Amino acid sequence: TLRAAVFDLDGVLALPAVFGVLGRTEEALALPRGLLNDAFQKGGPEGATTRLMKGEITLSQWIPLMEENCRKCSETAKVCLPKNFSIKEIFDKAISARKINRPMLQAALMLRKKGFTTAILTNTWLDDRAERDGLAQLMCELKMHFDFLIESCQVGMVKPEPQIYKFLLDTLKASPSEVVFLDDIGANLKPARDLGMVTILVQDTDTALKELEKVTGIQLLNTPAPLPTSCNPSDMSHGYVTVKPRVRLHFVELGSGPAVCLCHGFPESWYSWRYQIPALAQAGYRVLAMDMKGYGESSAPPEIEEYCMEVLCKEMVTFLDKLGLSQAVFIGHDWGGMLVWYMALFYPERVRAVASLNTPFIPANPNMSPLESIKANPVFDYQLYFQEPGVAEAELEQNLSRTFKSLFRASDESVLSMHKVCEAGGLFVNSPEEPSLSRMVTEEEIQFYVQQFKKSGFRGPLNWYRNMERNWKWACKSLGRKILIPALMVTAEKDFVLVPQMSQHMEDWIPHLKRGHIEDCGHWTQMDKPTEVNQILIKWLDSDAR
Amino acid sequence: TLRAAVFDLDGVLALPAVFGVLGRTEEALALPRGLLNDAFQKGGPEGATTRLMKGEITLSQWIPLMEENCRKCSETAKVCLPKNFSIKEIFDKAISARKINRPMLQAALMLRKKGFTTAILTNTWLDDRAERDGLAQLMCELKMHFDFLIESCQVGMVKPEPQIYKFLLDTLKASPSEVVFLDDIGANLKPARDLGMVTILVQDTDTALKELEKVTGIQLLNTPAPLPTSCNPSDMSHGYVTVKPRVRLHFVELGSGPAVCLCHGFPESWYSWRYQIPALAQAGYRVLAMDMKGYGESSAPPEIEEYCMEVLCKEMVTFLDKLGLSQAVFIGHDWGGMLVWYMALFYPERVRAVASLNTPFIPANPNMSPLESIKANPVFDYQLYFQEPGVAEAELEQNLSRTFKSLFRASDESVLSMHKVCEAGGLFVNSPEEPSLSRMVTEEEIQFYVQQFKKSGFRGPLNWYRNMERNWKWACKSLGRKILIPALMVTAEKDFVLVPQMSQHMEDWIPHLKRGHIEDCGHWTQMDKPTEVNQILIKWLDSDAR
Numbered sequence A, B: 001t002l003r004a005a006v007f008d009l010d011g012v013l014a015l016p017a018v019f020g021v022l023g024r025t026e027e028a029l030a031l032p033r034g035l036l037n038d039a040f041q042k043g044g045p046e047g048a049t050t051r052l053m054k055g056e057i058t059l060s061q062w063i064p065l066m067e068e069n070c071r072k073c074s075e076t077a078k079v080c081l082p083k084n085f086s087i088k089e090i091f092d093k094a095i096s097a098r099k100i101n102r103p104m105l106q107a108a109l110m111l112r113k114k115g116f117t118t119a120i121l122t123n124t125w126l127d128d129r130a131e132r133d134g135l136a137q138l139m140c141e142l143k144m145h146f147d148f149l150i151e152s153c154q155v156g157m158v159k160p161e162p163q164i165y166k167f168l169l170d171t172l173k174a175s176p177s178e179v180v181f182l183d184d185i186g187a188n189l190k191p192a193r194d195l196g197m198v199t200i201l202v203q204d205t206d207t208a209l210k211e212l213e214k215v216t217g218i219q220l221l222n223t224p225a226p227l228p229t230s231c232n233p234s235d236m237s238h239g240y241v242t243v244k245p246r247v248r249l250h251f252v253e254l255g256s257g258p259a260v261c262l263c264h265g266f267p268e269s270w271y272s273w274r275y276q277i278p279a280l281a282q283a284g285y286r287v288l289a290m291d292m293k294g295y296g297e298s299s300a301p302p303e304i305e306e307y308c309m310e311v312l313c314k315e316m317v318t319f320l321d322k323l324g325l326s327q328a329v330f331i332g333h334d335w336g337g338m339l340v341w342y343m344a345l346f347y348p349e350r351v352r353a354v355a356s357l358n359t360p361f362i363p364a365n366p367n368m369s370p371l372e373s374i375k376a377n378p379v380f381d382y383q384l385y386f387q388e389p390g391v392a393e394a395e396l397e398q399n400l401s402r403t404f405k406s407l408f409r410a411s412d413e414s415v416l417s418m419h420k421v422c423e424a425g426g427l428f429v430n431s432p433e434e435p436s437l438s439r440m441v442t443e444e445e446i447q448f449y450v451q452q453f454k455k456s457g458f459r460g461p462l463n464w465y466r467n468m469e470r471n472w473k474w475a476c477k478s479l480g481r482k483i484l485i486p487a488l489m490v491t492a493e494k495d496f497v498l499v500p501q502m503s504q505h506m507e508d509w510i511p512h513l514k515r516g517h518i519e520d521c522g523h524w525t526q527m528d529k530p531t532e533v534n535q536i537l538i539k540w541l542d543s544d545a546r
Ligand SMILES: O=C(N[C@H]1CC[C@H](Oc2ccc(C(=O)O)cc2)CC1)N[C@]12C[C@H]3C[C@H](C[C@H](C3)C1)C2
Pocket: A266, A267, A334, A335, A338, A359, A406, A407, A409, A410, A411, A413, A414, A415, A416, A418, A497, A522, A523
């Protein structure tokens, strides 16, 4: 019958509570017990703190009123406050110490996932201090995980006034018996309980969570590690930049701080970085996830030479120029990974740092055509099949659902044989016509790629493979160079085409190269091991790209 | 007959030249004259420096080769280099000291304006040093002002090889006698001169510019102060964010660093900030210029209540949330200026700093309806005319060209009388049917506004005026508050509706308010005095919003 869960901020979703810091300051300063809490509440509904919580005055206007409340309390208590007493210092440290209670947030996320409406109902102030950014940052991280955020200072009502609970019920469109309410202050539970709501008094998180599992019938404690927060395309800021008359690049943007450009592989989308876009923004970076040329909402000219590495890299520099970015960190995977190594070799001044997932830095061999080196390895046979225009397009566009379901698979789910593709006469010759859904992706995620490839088709994406000779000649120009800017190479143990051993001689070209390695990871790295990728990238960015 | 002008970077568009720093280091370190310049050129076409300029090796790979060239030169000269000798330190300081030669750039801009094709042809390197950002930043500022940028390390050719001059002519589609070429190194002029090009040897800027005026017949020296760099809409990154199901906000974005949100007034566009968008990005800020709700590419629902201040401010906070910005500096003008004061009063944590152009902070009077206060001032009579839905829309939409030409005027060009608008029966009753073009705007600029208002119309924009009672009730909630975050009020001397005297009691509400004042400036501040606005905003941002 329960369908809504309301949480308080201070003491429930964020720890420690302000009141806890007030009690700890009395002990540290050897003041009489409760003196700071008495000054805090002095006057009740007509006092300074109620005016602050109703949004009548701001935090800075309240600080001198709280200080005089402290002196009046000490006069009565017959004590002297220390020579260096400051409400501002005490409050700054208290607000700064507050961190998200991860287990409490994890339980809130699981409830919403199972169909619950979630909300935060809190008594808070209009923060105008010089350090107010810390509070804003915390609220933003929490905001995206709940259906509603109700703050006292915005609605002009405070807990425990009964009208704020009537307002809460009208916002949720729910009756009181369909609501569970969590708060660390007993007084605030009393009116919710009077209306008939299920209340949980929060003293310690683990006990609070056990009461919550019992009443909802959903397991919250001891639960498996969840996947990182993913992107909803319709909630993203969508950017459009024209780099040349017929070419427009589309990107998705989130966060503030140093620019980080993400470059996908074949046959993918900006959406392949869905698990890293919120994580990198939260770590303090401005993320720009591209639809590469030939894909999604980016332009897709039909000409083959529009997709050679030289044209592609030049358009990426123009993209930075039109956005007003002197530098960006470049992170690529698959074809995008090959492109970022060549961005570092040809435009080092525009690249703050460079990282590749799966794709090693392959220097051109001046004594051998790339097409002849492809024939030496039977694993690369699918590349020869991709050369004839129209042939692979017809097979991949014939059934879009089948195409993405057969390709996007974890290492133990492979349904295609990438060798003898030419001899068989296709990629899907001895392949099931209706493949099973991989554990890595959902039907909804697959349908995004199907919808994006319904507009463009496979011509543009396949053309990245039809410039082998042209790319080989261009790469030969960089044979005497070394990559001396910060660099990261991440290998994936189970990629059968881009094997980790293909990257072993990279130190000869990138002497101070840093490495990452992911076990039990196939070709589709970002969606196969999203947590591991996030950890490797965030640690490297914080040490080498700052 | 001349139609193209080519400039060198080092020693021409950027001063001082690297070679100058090399000569100054020999004097400072008491080394034999020319020793550093000999090591620099050692080997000619087969030497390290030619390999560096052709892009064969990077700057970091070259530094140890230049150092051994310095030792071999000192062995022959029978001298000992100082114990602390470092090519890296010498080059870092030389590159860092280089600044744009403003008079040279100003002359290049004027030539392009008068129909010339402009280009930079330079001998440069692939910069992979840890400080390479400084070079990237400089190149970006220059890049946007020229038709072509040709760098030796990218084309694999160097000056003075004759092939690089053939490549230059083929890029410009011009014959040698149609080209003027400026360089500070005589050797590089020789091959251009052989082809028949007009060459100018640059020793000092003023003499170089006088030779350039004589040969082009265009005055470059002693010229009036130009207007700041303006925006070309088709070259901007366009962003689209959905803040609620039927409401999508459009914005234009440029630069990196702290976020600065620009909010236009009535009846304007993001385009009203065209003169400040490049300046604020160049000062080190990430600019977001909005199309406010009801305007341009932003949604325009017809309902009146969709434009009350409360809804408008809430959508601006959502806009920051979807972009991943915890804070932004808010700068508004006219209706946008009124909105940013209320953003600071209602959401101080999301506002880093707040600035208003023309619009004073007007606190609500609880003892008087806003409509009655409007009737007390005959200047505000046009506001009563705007109340009836459909009436002002029909008059303003009847002829879009006339509407924008009659409104956008400098202080001494007024063609409308904003008082007795109701008694006359319209805004354009005794107004010319074909007004003259104001000196403030061009026909092309006017046509942008006409094109944008052809889609939306005036319903949405006029609805900002049809919520007087609703805005008054909402504002009354903030009567006990003070604005204690960094704030700037800019007054415009000749605004006859928003007079500077209307802002005199603002210190009572914003005690540490900073002020700006612009003389001989009418209502349309950004386009009336763009240089003055830029200077006031950049100085305040650097001191109070950093
Ligand atoms: O071919 C390239 N990727 C393919 C993309 C599709 C994938 O299909 C798969 C992947 C996995 C499975 C499975 O587990 O069943 C099946 C099919 C196979 C690899 N990328 C490059 C990237 C650079 C430049 C050039 C040469 C070299 C280095 C490889 C192309």
